[PDB]
Amino acid sequence: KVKLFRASEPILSVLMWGVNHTINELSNVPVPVMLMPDDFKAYSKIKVDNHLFNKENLPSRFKFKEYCPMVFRNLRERFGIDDQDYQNSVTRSAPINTRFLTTYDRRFVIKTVSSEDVAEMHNILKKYHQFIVECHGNTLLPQFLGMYRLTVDGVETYMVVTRNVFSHRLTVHRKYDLKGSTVAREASDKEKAKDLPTFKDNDFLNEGQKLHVGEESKKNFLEKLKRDVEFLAQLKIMDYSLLVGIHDVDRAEQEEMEVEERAEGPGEFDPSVDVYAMKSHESSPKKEVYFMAIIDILTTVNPEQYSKRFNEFMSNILT
Amino acid sequence: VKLFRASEPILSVLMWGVNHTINELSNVPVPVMLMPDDFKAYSKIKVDNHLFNKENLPSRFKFKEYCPMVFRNLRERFGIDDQDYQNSVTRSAPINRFLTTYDRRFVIKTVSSEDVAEMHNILKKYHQFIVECHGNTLLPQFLGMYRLTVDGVETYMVVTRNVFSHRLTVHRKYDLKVAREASDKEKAKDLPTFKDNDFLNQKLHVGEESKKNFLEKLKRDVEFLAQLKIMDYSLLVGIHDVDRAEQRFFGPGEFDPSVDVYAMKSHESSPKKEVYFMAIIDILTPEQYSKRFNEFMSNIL
Ligand SMILES: Nc1ncnc2c1ncn2[C@@H]1O[C@H](COP(=O)(O)OP(=O)(O)NP(=O)(O)O)[C@@H](O)[C@H]1O
């Protein structure tokens, strides 16, 4: 049952160590009836200075800092995530990939951020938590599960953990980053020649792509979108995108059969897990699954105007 | 949930620290052998919490464990499971600097910085002695050694196995090592610590059988100690009186010899039915004291 924290780079193993440590300590801390103001200004810090001990995978010397752990544990709770599960998917095997990682099981995403981002998080955290609670966790917004600072070789590195917009099991065959903004966003020649290019607004437009999801899902989604984007506007926030992943069910059935031949449900998902996933309309051309969420909310137009244009472009995304 | 509630914050840090280091060790593989770096090694962690988890721990403190691999191995060679050790330190606060765990299994002794230096000077030879005697000794069993920093002051502690039983009440105590005895001011205490001249003037008979094993062990121990130029140590004797204890259920004079490692049953030819505990203590602060000590303690049984 041991945990070597073996990882490709020393700061990944420090990440694993720190998530493991803080989740254990938290397991020793009772679960409060309510959050109090200073939970939003709180942190935990540890400094480790080992010597000739346990240095197969961890560095002898490192620091780990968790921000407002009572508040992020609460957020995890409101997002339907068990702390044991979170810990396990960070620490049971190395995350794989400023920098962008995924837990080995693709449940969670770990993004390196800047000092300034950490500041943005602190000043919006109370209002964001209040938002999450009055919308019961039903939001296209990023679900923030934890925020850390690692110190390795005297270098500080800030990280935010977030739920994967995409499914942990269904393959993403196409993806767009949409802002709806006035001036042209097409994907690059370098990006378009990549394996899974992140396409942009005008790519989506000039592909003629529509997204048929049918009425009840369309309404749920658009209502989430209105509430979220007005929340962001009132926080005076701009330049966020909607991330759109497309999964082709037929294509994945063929991919799976090809790997299973080389060994010599289908297009169905757990909405409790793949929380941004929607199946295509019962009368849709190709059986598809989409994943749509807002991203990059940390860091001509004003934020109210950003809200308006974003909501219009995303509502016309889908029939 | 393991709230580290304790009389002093230093005991809260000790509980937190043992918990933390044993859990971390459960993630460190048991090596095929100890290596020389293990005898020069330590772990250190500094905690700085701001408005978080302040309910029983200090927000700021430090914890250092000397030579964790060596002491985990000694724990194994003394037949002590790490989870059990952890449980005896962490599950409830130790109690009365000299403490025992709440279950009285282990003693926690506050210790000088020079003692820590003497421990690092004797530890490697002491480990190989524990090896060569397959862990049956009367020497103190060192289970772990820690430096705690709370409120800016350092505090060094050694954890050792209790000489007395963790269940059976001990009635008479003797600290036997120039004549010394107990003092009228110490005499007005609950369980007196009596010395060797008080004893000589607590009549111990264990039979012809156990005496042989016991004194083979003692001679081996104090020969090694003399070879270490260690002197001025004690043999600690405790006497539990069954009939007095009388005046589902454990039995009177009932003990687990795997737990109460030093216990020793009465002989028949003994005026009262007792159980006695014996072990060498206080070896951290010459040959003449090897010979005189051996002679005395054997003519005590
Ligand atoms: N070189 C350093 N060594 C030690 N601590 C440091 C160092 N640099 C920064 N810190 C601390 O680490 C914090 C984290 O960085 P920062 O991104 O500014 O957080 P913050 O937004 O100012 N926190 P908050 O006031 O709750 O919003 C800094 O504010 C300092 O408290």
XYZ file of C-alpha atoms and ligand atoms in Angstrom:
651
model
C 0.000 0.000 0.000
C 3.147 2.147 -0.032
C 3.368 5.375 -2.043
C 6.760 6.049 -3.616
C 5.624 9.322 -5.228
C 7.744 8.244 -8.198
C 7.454 10.840 -10.961
C 9.185 12.121 -14.084
C 10.204 15.438 -12.450
C 10.895 16.260 -8.795
C 8.144 18.810 -8.516
C 5.474 16.350 -9.711
C 6.492 14.046 -6.857
C 6.392 16.992 -4.476
C 2.884 17.683 -5.776
C 1.875 14.104 -5.068
C 3.476 14.233 -1.630
C 1.689 17.504 -0.763
C -1.758 16.464 -1.921
C -1.269 13.275 0.079
C -0.090 15.124 3.183
C -2.771 17.826 3.173
C -5.624 15.432 2.452
C -4.447 13.244 5.372
C -4.159 16.178 7.775
C -7.599 17.336 6.592
C -8.903 13.875 7.383
C -7.890 14.645 10.964
C -9.824 17.978 10.918
C -13.586 17.935 11.635
C -15.944 19.095 8.916
C -17.380 22.502 9.872
C -21.051 23.406 9.956
C -20.187 26.697 8.213
C -17.181 28.452 6.714
C -15.981 31.463 8.577
C -14.395 34.613 7.065
C -10.835 33.740 8.040
C -11.106 30.342 6.323
C -10.843 32.548 3.197
C -7.586 34.115 4.356
C -6.076 30.909 5.733
C -3.264 28.670 4.556
C -1.099 25.741 5.591
C 2.668 25.675 5.031
C 5.159 22.864 5.561
C 8.933 22.873 5.050
C 10.742 19.541 4.724
C 14.533 19.370 5.192
C 15.445 15.720 5.151
C 19.014 14.518 5.302
C 20.247 11.134 4.044
C 16.651 9.947 4.284
C 13.882 9.126 1.851
C 15.479 10.775 -1.141
C 14.826 8.101 -3.770
C 11.950 10.125 -5.156
C 11.320 13.222 -3.108
C 13.999 15.904 -2.939
C 15.567 16.137 0.522
C 14.381 19.772 0.748
C 11.068 21.245 -0.374
C 8.142 23.438 0.721
C 4.412 22.939 0.196
C 1.639 25.501 0.738
C -2.117 24.979 0.474
C -4.441 27.974 0.220
C -7.712 28.196 2.174
C -7.919 24.411 2.642
C -11.225 24.517 4.550
C -12.766 26.371 1.605
C -11.380 24.115 -1.106
C -12.371 20.991 0.840
C -15.878 22.464 0.978
C -15.782 23.154 -2.766
C -14.781 19.553 -3.404
C -17.745 18.511 -1.282
C -20.211 20.707 -3.209
C -18.833 19.344 -6.516
C -19.508 15.712 -5.530
C -15.851 14.738 -5.016
C -14.645 12.557 -2.170
C -11.338 13.617 -0.603
C -10.037 10.045 -0.600
C -10.802 9.857 -4.328
C -9.093 13.179 -5.065
C -6.035 12.113 -3.110
C -5.906 8.764 -4.820
C -6.069 10.116 -8.316
C -3.301 12.616 -7.621
C -1.034 10.228 -5.678
C -1.675 6.667 -6.885
C 0.397 7.323 -10.027
C 2.167 10.370 -11.437
C 0.138 13.060 -13.180
C 0.914 13.230 -16.908
C 0.886 16.189 -19.295
C 2.604 27.521 -18.357
C 2.458 23.747 -17.657
C -0.617 21.506 -17.966
C -1.051 18.085 -16.368
C -3.787 15.520 -15.930
C -4.105 12.952 -13.191
C -3.215 9.516 -14.424
C -6.927 8.633 -14.554
C -7.947 11.889 -16.295
C -10.403 12.982 -13.635
C -8.538 16.150 -12.658
C -6.468 18.787 -14.435
C -3.548 20.602 -12.834
C -2.549 23.951 -14.269
C 0.503 26.007 -13.395
C -0.469 29.603 -12.739
C 1.215 32.813 -11.746
C 1.371 34.860 -8.597
C -1.224 37.171 -10.086
C -3.624 34.293 -10.689
C -3.383 33.247 -7.054
C -4.286 36.817 -6.130
C -7.316 36.788 -8.457
C -8.444 33.588 -6.781
C -8.227 35.074 -3.302
C -10.229 38.111 -4.158
C -12.941 36.190 -5.960
C -13.050 33.150 -3.634
C -15.781 34.302 -1.271
C -18.065 35.386 -4.104
C -17.296 32.244 -6.099
C -18.062 29.959 -3.156
C -21.280 31.848 -2.573
C -22.031 31.336 -6.265
C -21.321 27.591 -6.154
C -23.550 27.229 -3.120
C -26.541 29.135 -4.485
C -26.356 27.277 -7.798
C -25.815 23.921 -6.011
C -22.665 23.142 -7.993
C -24.513 23.185 -11.339
C -22.245 25.512 -13.295
C -20.271 25.570 -16.530
C -17.626 27.433 -14.530
C -14.355 25.792 -13.550
C -14.724 23.689 -10.437
C -11.746 24.656 -8.291
C -10.662 21.768 -6.034
C -7.372 23.004 -4.603
C -4.667 25.602 -4.924
C -1.034 25.119 -3.999
C 2.398 26.634 -4.043
C 5.354 24.271 -4.342
C 8.932 25.241 -3.640
C 11.610 23.075 -5.235
C 15.248 24.117 -5.622
C 14.285 27.503 -4.245
C 11.827 28.064 -7.085
C 8.166 28.680 -6.332
C 5.462 27.189 -8.541
C 1.753 27.901 -8.186
C -0.833 25.282 -9.186
C -4.635 25.109 -9.355
C -6.527 21.782 -9.521
C -9.760 21.673 -11.505
C -12.200 19.088 -12.786
C -11.490 17.848 -16.333
C -13.867 19.431 -18.805
C -13.569 16.321 -20.974
C -14.598 12.810 -19.976
C -12.210 10.603 -18.070
C -12.930 7.787 -20.537
C -14.543 9.051 -23.798
C -11.999 10.200 -26.367
C -12.088 13.776 -27.632
C -11.863 13.787 -31.438
C -12.302 17.528 -31.978
C -11.952 20.601 -29.797
C -12.599 24.347 -29.997
C -11.766 27.297 -27.751
C -14.485 29.887 -28.317
C -14.585 33.488 -27.096
C -17.143 34.994 -29.488
C -14.966 38.065 -29.785
C -15.068 40.675 -32.494
C -11.635 40.185 -34.167
C -10.599 37.005 -35.905
C -9.592 33.900 -33.976
C -8.558 31.048 -36.241
C -6.249 28.265 -35.149
C -2.625 28.480 -36.256
C -0.835 26.574 -39.001
C 1.341 25.008 -36.301
C -1.727 24.323 -34.139
C -3.829 23.073 -37.086
C -1.054 20.639 -38.010
C -0.915 19.321 -34.426
C -2.589 16.068 -33.417
C -5.698 17.408 -31.718
C -5.765 21.091 -32.737
C -7.512 23.595 -30.492
C -9.693 25.303 -33.051
C -11.123 28.748 -32.554
C -14.187 30.823 -33.385
C -13.790 31.343 -37.110
C -12.644 27.739 -37.596
C -15.941 26.670 -36.014
C -17.901 29.122 -38.170
C -16.271 28.223 -41.505
C -16.623 24.519 -40.677
C -20.394 25.081 -40.618
C -20.474 22.906 -37.510
C -23.659 22.942 -35.466
C -24.252 21.028 -32.225
C -27.604 19.218 -32.007
C -28.321 18.286 -28.368
C -32.093 18.627 -28.146
C -34.327 20.794 -26.056
C -34.021 19.808 -22.392
C -30.216 19.777 -22.514
C -30.125 22.979 -24.543
C -32.218 24.764 -21.916
C -30.243 23.447 -18.945
C -27.011 24.513 -20.657
C -28.170 27.996 -21.698
C -29.476 28.689 -18.193
C -26.153 27.702 -16.651
C -24.482 29.936 -19.227
C -26.604 33.006 -18.480
C -26.050 32.687 -14.733
C -22.295 31.982 -15.050
C -21.470 34.750 -17.486
C -23.441 37.339 -15.533
C -21.551 36.205 -12.421
C -18.237 36.757 -14.224
C -19.346 40.111 -15.640
C -20.223 41.306 -12.166
C -16.824 40.138 -10.931
C -15.343 42.349 -13.711
C -13.739 39.409 -15.545
C -13.070 38.975 -19.253
C -11.261 36.853 -21.888
C -12.620 33.534 -20.590
C -13.484 30.901 -23.200
C -15.902 28.064 -23.684
C -14.044 24.811 -24.264
C -15.879 22.417 -26.583
C -14.806 18.789 -27.030
C -16.528 16.557 -29.596
C -16.513 12.754 -29.224
C -17.491 10.686 -32.273
C -19.145 7.483 -31.093
C -18.736 5.575 -34.380
C -15.096 6.599 -34.612
C -14.382 5.450 -31.064
C -16.095 2.112 -31.633
C -13.745 1.592 -34.558
C -10.687 2.777 -32.587
C -11.535 0.401 -29.727
C -12.101 -2.518 -32.099
C -8.759 -1.769 -33.775
C -6.800 -1.845 -30.518
C -8.754 -4.948 -29.426
C -7.908 -6.661 -32.726
C -4.250 -5.679 -32.350
C -4.505 -7.434 -28.986
C -4.286 -10.723 -30.963
C -21.794 1.348 -23.042
C -20.826 2.877 -26.387
C -21.020 6.661 -26.378
C -22.632 6.510 -22.921
C -21.292 8.266 -19.832
C -21.754 8.832 -16.105
C -23.147 12.390 -15.729
C -22.188 12.327 -12.046
C -18.622 12.056 -13.378
C -18.498 13.497 -16.880
C -20.469 16.446 -15.537
C -20.186 18.584 -18.705
C -21.185 15.805 -21.115
C -24.294 15.828 -23.329
C -25.480 13.245 -25.818
C -26.556 14.376 -29.254
C -30.260 14.761 -30.123
C -32.209 11.519 -30.612
C -32.713 12.693 -34.229
C -29.064 13.786 -34.771
C -27.014 12.840 -37.867
C -24.004 11.174 -36.246
C -24.185 9.837 -32.701
C -21.896 12.194 -30.770
C -21.128 13.359 -27.246
C -20.079 16.910 -26.460
C -18.286 18.427 -23.482
C -18.689 22.166 -22.982
C -17.442 24.317 -20.129
C -16.054 27.728 -19.332
C -12.293 28.000 -18.776
C -9.572 30.612 -18.100
C -11.360 32.867 -15.633
C -8.210 33.789 -13.683
C -5.627 35.024 -16.330
C -12.542 47.769 -27.011
C -14.698 45.596 -24.731
C -15.927 45.874 -21.106
C -16.860 42.821 -18.996
C -20.619 43.414 -19.286
C -20.126 43.587 -23.062
C -17.874 40.520 -22.898
C -20.686 38.719 -21.076
C -23.220 39.737 -23.735
C -21.147 38.753 -26.791
C -20.026 35.480 -25.175
C -23.585 34.468 -24.311
C -24.849 35.227 -27.818
C -22.067 33.292 -29.568
C -22.463 30.286 -27.291
C -26.248 30.261 -27.560
C -25.932 30.172 -31.345
C -23.345 27.378 -30.992
C -26.020 24.743 -30.757
C -29.427 23.860 -32.185
C -10.359 11.536 13.449
C -7.118 12.029 15.466
C -7.389 15.324 17.322
C -4.069 15.798 19.074
C -5.496 17.049 22.383
C -2.918 17.179 25.161
C -2.009 18.826 28.458
C 0.913 20.792 26.971
C 1.301 21.924 23.350
C 4.611 20.076 23.393
C 2.754 16.812 23.909
C 0.438 17.794 21.036
C 3.443 18.315 18.791
C 4.919 15.010 19.951
C 1.683 13.167 19.115
C 1.391 14.955 15.767
C 5.056 14.217 15.053
C 5.037 10.490 15.818
C 1.853 10.139 13.758
C 3.417 12.019 10.876
C 6.763 10.229 10.815
C 5.320 6.749 11.197
C 2.806 7.386 8.404
C 5.627 8.692 6.211
C 7.755 5.625 7.050
C 4.930 3.371 5.973
C 5.717 4.750 2.539
C 9.451 3.996 2.874
C 10.365 0.376 1.963
C 12.014 -1.788 4.607
C 15.590 -2.148 3.286
C 17.555 -5.379 3.105
C 19.955 -3.818 5.623
C 20.812 -0.583 7.304
C 23.493 1.473 5.650
C 25.983 3.872 7.235
C 24.051 6.953 6.054
C 21.099 5.672 8.049
C 23.209 6.348 11.162
C 23.928 9.967 10.095
C 20.393 10.709 8.901
C 17.298 12.612 10.005
C 13.926 13.932 8.951
C 12.833 17.491 9.750
C 9.532 19.213 9.067
C 8.475 22.774 9.886
C 4.751 23.576 10.168
C 3.506 27.142 9.648
C -0.308 27.286 9.704
C -2.229 30.535 9.431
C -5.785 30.533 10.828
C -6.072 26.785 10.286
C -6.090 23.671 12.509
C -5.123 25.804 15.522
C -7.630 24.019 17.772
C -5.099 21.668 19.370
C -1.719 22.136 17.710
C 0.474 25.225 17.731
C 0.216 27.032 14.402
C 4.032 27.058 14.150
C 6.300 24.240 15.269
C 9.094 21.920 14.150
C 9.737 18.201 14.446
C 13.012 16.323 13.836
C 13.493 12.560 13.946
C 17.014 11.250 14.299
C 17.892 8.211 12.187
C 14.365 7.070 11.365
C 15.474 3.920 9.493
C 17.627 2.738 12.400
C 14.928 3.211 15.025
C 12.229 1.626 12.859
C 14.532 -1.364 12.539
C 15.175 -1.440 16.289
C 11.422 -1.329 16.801
C 11.128 -4.397 14.601
C 13.980 -6.171 16.376
C 12.228 -5.400 19.661
C 9.078 -7.014 18.245
C 7.035 -3.794 18.127
C 4.719 -3.019 15.205
C 4.842 0.536 13.870
C 1.063 0.913 13.822
C 0.996 -0.129 17.474
C 3.731 2.333 18.486
C 1.894 5.071 16.623
C -1.351 4.124 18.352
C 0.202 4.243 21.821
C 1.559 7.732 21.219
C -1.265 9.252 19.202
C -4.585 7.845 20.299
C -4.583 9.726 23.586
C -2.189 12.171 25.203
C 0.744 10.774 27.207
C 0.523 11.368 30.947
C 2.965 12.069 33.801
C 10.001 15.292 32.436
C 8.928 11.649 32.284
C 5.755 10.383 30.658
C 4.198 7.145 29.591
C 1.807 6.567 26.759
C -1.832 6.470 27.796
C -1.646 2.661 27.747
C 1.605 2.741 29.755
C 3.372 0.644 27.122
C 6.159 3.165 26.387
C 8.097 5.736 28.433
C 8.875 9.170 26.959
C 11.913 10.763 28.582
C 13.027 14.339 28.086
C 16.730 14.355 27.490
C 19.762 16.645 27.267
C 21.327 17.665 23.987
C 24.521 15.974 25.115
C 22.507 12.797 25.604
C 21.480 12.982 21.943
C 25.184 13.310 21.166
C 25.940 10.252 23.274
C 23.130 8.373 21.515
C 24.592 9.211 18.126
C 27.966 8.047 19.459
C 26.669 4.692 20.707
C 23.844 4.010 18.239
C 25.679 1.926 15.610
C 27.444 -0.369 18.083
C 24.183 -0.532 20.040
C 22.264 -1.618 16.935
C 24.715 -4.359 16.123
C 24.588 -5.484 19.733
C 20.779 -5.701 19.510
C 21.384 -7.718 16.328
C 23.915 -10.119 17.860
C 21.819 -10.708 20.999
C 18.708 -11.251 18.816
C 16.991 -8.494 20.715
C 16.869 -10.179 24.114
C 18.599 -7.779 26.451
C 17.931 -5.910 29.618
C 19.391 -2.739 28.115
C 16.964 0.111 27.511
C 15.099 -0.464 24.238
C 15.356 2.742 22.230
C 12.234 3.041 20.062
C 12.631 6.566 18.698
C 14.383 9.871 19.241
C 13.016 13.313 18.493
C 13.718 17.015 18.716
C 10.660 19.244 19.112
C 10.568 23.006 18.574
C 7.552 24.756 20.074
C 7.602 28.464 20.962
C 11.236 28.726 19.920
C 12.689 26.281 22.465
C 14.049 22.889 21.460
C 13.149 19.787 23.464
C 14.792 16.390 22.968
C 12.966 13.147 23.713
C 13.775 9.418 23.729
C 11.000 6.833 23.680
C 11.746 3.548 25.366
C 9.894 0.459 26.461
C 8.393 0.564 29.951
C 10.259 -1.646 32.400
C 7.129 -2.101 34.529
C 4.015 -3.880 33.305
C 1.446 -1.769 31.460
C -1.297 -3.513 33.445
C -0.113 -4.981 36.767
C 0.209 -2.349 39.515
C 3.770 -2.126 40.842
C 3.949 -1.732 44.606
C 7.645 -1.590 45.544
C 10.343 0.052 43.414
C 14.128 -0.259 43.669
C 16.874 1.651 41.819
C 20.051 -0.318 42.423
C 23.576 0.675 41.387
C 29.380 4.048 48.263
C 25.996 3.557 49.949
C 22.848 5.369 48.802
C 19.306 5.023 50.144
C 15.923 6.752 49.893
C 15.369 10.117 51.580
C 12.796 11.067 54.240
C 11.537 13.651 51.738
C 11.288 11.044 48.992
C 9.995 8.569 51.588
C 6.775 10.586 51.838
C 5.872 9.659 48.251
C 3.304 7.282 46.783
C 5.631 4.702 45.147
C 9.094 5.204 46.704
C 12.249 5.055 44.604
C 14.533 3.145 47.001
C 18.252 2.647 46.330
C 20.669 -0.210 46.969
C 21.568 0.320 50.656
C 17.882 0.744 51.512
C 17.281 -2.574 49.723
C 20.134 -4.544 51.315
C 18.684 -3.806 54.754
C 11.903 -6.747 48.398
C 13.345 -10.241 48.892
C 13.464 -11.553 45.313
C 13.457 -15.268 44.400
C 12.591 -16.365 40.853
C 13.882 -19.938 41.041
C 17.073 -21.615 39.910
C 15.590 -21.717 36.389
C 15.135 -18.091 35.308
C 18.121 -16.713 37.266
C 20.514 -18.416 34.833
C 18.979 -16.848 31.724
C 18.580 -13.516 33.532
C 22.204 -13.244 34.572
C 23.618 -14.546 31.304
C 21.699 -11.636 29.795
C 22.860 -9.116 32.412
C 26.522 -10.098 32.113
C 26.406 -9.762 28.325
C 24.706 -6.361 28.606
C 27.006 -4.748 31.153
C 30.097 -6.149 29.457
C 29.018 -4.350 26.283
C 28.249 -1.212 28.303
C 31.665 -1.257 29.983
C 33.271 -1.777 26.578
C 31.457 1.471 25.650
C 33.083 3.252 28.653
C 29.513 3.840 29.904
C 29.137 3.916 33.680
C 26.818 4.984 36.519
C 23.745 3.118 35.252
C 21.028 1.346 37.239
C 19.119 -1.867 37.404
C 15.443 -1.071 37.926
C 13.397 -3.595 39.931
C 9.651 -3.480 40.454
C 7.577 -5.688 42.747
C 3.862 -6.350 42.193
C 2.119 -8.190 45.049
C -0.675 -10.455 43.812
C -2.577 -11.027 47.055
C -2.625 -7.277 47.662
C -3.916 -6.647 44.147
C -6.817 -8.963 44.969
C -7.787 -6.908 48.044
C -14.172 -10.420 30.756
C -11.594 -10.293 33.560
C -7.845 -10.358 33.692
C -6.498 -12.566 36.465
C -4.296 -11.603 39.397
C -0.673 -12.000 38.432
C -1.791 -12.434 34.805
C 0.454 -10.826 32.208
C 1.433 -11.136 28.542
C 5.195 -11.855 28.469
C 5.288 -10.613 24.851
C 4.065 -7.185 26.052
C 5.401 -6.980 29.628
C 8.759 -8.083 28.304
C 10.552 -7.762 31.640
C 8.022 -9.508 33.907
C 9.079 -12.566 35.895
C 6.810 -14.859 37.919
C 7.298 -15.894 41.549
C 8.812 -19.105 42.756
C 6.718 -21.342 44.985
C 9.204 -21.045 47.868
C 8.483 -17.336 48.283
C 6.658 -15.971 51.365
C 4.277 -13.916 49.208
C 3.166 -14.516 45.612
C 4.605 -11.700 43.480
C 5.634 -10.765 39.957
C 8.863 -8.812 39.478
C 10.256 -6.596 36.697
C 13.953 -6.022 36.030
C 15.972 -4.132 33.454
C 18.977 -1.870 32.953
C 18.160 1.850 32.800
C 19.891 5.209 32.334
C 22.853 4.327 30.079
C 23.285 7.664 28.295
C 25.074 9.997 30.704
C 34.208 2.069 34.101
C 34.951 -1.662 34.175
C 34.976 -1.420 37.971
C 31.325 -0.472 37.725
C 30.821 -3.435 35.387
C 32.104 -5.906 37.978
C 30.545 -4.355 41.103
C 27.152 -3.947 39.396
C 27.098 -7.537 38.126
C 28.046 -8.969 41.537
C 25.430 -6.915 43.415
C 22.445 -7.550 41.171
C 23.086 -11.292 41.004
C 23.418 -11.579 44.779
C 20.020 -9.758 44.781
C 18.242 -12.837 43.350
N 10.363 34.150 -1.708
C 9.379 33.893 -0.842
N 9.661 33.195 0.285
C 8.675 32.941 1.152
N 7.388 33.285 1.078
C 7.139 33.971 -0.047
C 8.048 34.308 -1.034
N 7.431 35.019 -2.052
C 6.181 35.088 -1.666
N 5.932 34.476 -0.466
C 4.660 34.396 0.225
O 3.790 33.546 -0.513
C 2.603 34.285 -0.875
C 1.938 33.682 -2.093
O 2.022 34.573 -3.202
P 0.818 35.528 -3.758
O 0.523 35.065 -5.134
O 1.074 37.048 -3.771
O -0.408 35.314 -2.749
P -1.413 36.428 -2.283
O -2.430 36.658 -3.348
O -0.661 37.775 -2.019
N -2.168 35.819 -0.898
P -3.580 36.598 -0.351
O -3.188 37.884 0.478
O -4.384 35.616 0.599
O -4.463 37.017 -1.479
C 3.114 35.716 -0.929
O 2.088 36.678 -0.748
C 3.974 35.747 0.315
O 3.138 35.622 1.452
